[PDB]
Amino acid sequence: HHHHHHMVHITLDRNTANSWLIISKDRRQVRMGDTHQNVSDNKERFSNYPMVLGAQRFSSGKMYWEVDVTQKEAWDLGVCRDSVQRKGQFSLSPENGFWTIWLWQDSYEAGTSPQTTLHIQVPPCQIGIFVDYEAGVVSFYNITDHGSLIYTFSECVFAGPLRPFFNVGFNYSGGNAAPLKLCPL
């Protein structure tokens, strides 16, 4: 792909984070803490899952960023509407305002309803995410495998401003403590 020139500098929004997340001082890394991280509750925080949004809102144009997923066993990445549900249980689907992929139990899947199996020969250590607002496209790239395409959502109905979306995943196994990191430009 030749999307790298639409690179945007993403930072995480502490106020949206699940109360167990630890966001680095530079707002570029997030990991799940061992306990509640001593913050007040608010209506923005994801309650049920270890999720957080980027601070940036996109309503036009082309945007690209990269995320490091090294040594994680589970995670979700992509974009979502600014108006997505924060409290209770929900599925990641375009009907609920999410355009995402994930790793779970040694398989990669796109967050369609129902979910779509992905075909990845080289497990990625860094993921590129491209959004074309006007075209209604969200695409995912395998930076470890020379930028190969992972998945394209097309005919997207965003229906609002978009925010970068992250889920560090649970850590019941002891094998998923590693952070998500926003990679430098």
Ligand SMILES: CCC(=O)N1CCC[C@@H](NS(C)(=O)=O)C1
């Ligand atoms: C997402 C935060 C939360 O509700 N919890 C409670 C359930 C298990 C906890 N910890 S764990 C096993 O290390 O993932 C995290």
